[PDB]
């Protein structure tokens, strides 16, 4: 392997040969939504997350979506959030048998149910309309919500460092 500054979530899963943990799921969600919110503000077009290969985790803890007011366009925020929600659940389910299901903490399960529009605060949360809505739910996972920006960067920084050693050195 050769050392670089980003790995895809697909590569991360392949290297681990196991699913991501719950804290990593919250972190990728928060960090990727932050990147997407900023990209939209700078008028880069929205597009959907088609697969885990498109999600890039960086050395400094950033998470971005690789390339292919603006409130309405050919790709709405909720569509991007849905596609991200589905990919995050696949990452949490990675390698499990079809007849097994992971027992997620209720607030993480709820976040994902609402991201993915699979819903059929203790019963149901307000519908997610924006990247900021998702980020606020991830911040709420923490006892002190103002810790979120630093915390979720630190989570992805560690995930990168840990998998980069497998990337560089696994044969």
């Amino acid at each position: 392997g050769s050392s670089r500054d980003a790995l895809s979530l697909e590569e991360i899963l392949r290297l681990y040969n196991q699913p991501i943990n719950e804290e990593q799921a919250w972190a990728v969600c928060y960090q990727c939504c932050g990147s997407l919110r900023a990209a939209a503000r700078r008028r880069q077009p929205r597009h959907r997350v088609r697969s885990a290969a498109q999600i890039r985790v960086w050395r400094d803890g950033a998470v971005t979506l690789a390339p292919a007011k603006l409130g309405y366009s050919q790709c709405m925020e909720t569509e991007v959030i849905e596609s991200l929600g589905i990919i995050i659940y696949k990452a949490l389910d990675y390698g499990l048998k079809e007849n097994e299901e992971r027992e997620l903490s209720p607030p993480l399960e709820q976040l994902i149910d609402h991201m993915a529009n699979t819903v059929e605060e203790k019963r149901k949360i307000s519908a997610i309309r924006s990247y900021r809505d998702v980020m606020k739910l991830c911040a709420a996972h923490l006892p002190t919500e103002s810790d979120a920006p630093n915390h979720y960067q630190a989570v992805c920084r560690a995930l990168f460092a840990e998998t980069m050693e497998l990337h560089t050195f696994l044969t």
Binding site: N99, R102, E109
Partner: peptide, 21 residues
């Protein structure tokens, strides 16, 4: 890290997400 798993429920989140592929 997966650790804790249950049997797949017929109406649960895994069930619903699988049908969106």
């Amino acid at each position: 890290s997966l650790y804790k798993i249950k049997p797949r429920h017929d109406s649960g989140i895994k069930a619903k997400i699988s049908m969106k592929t």
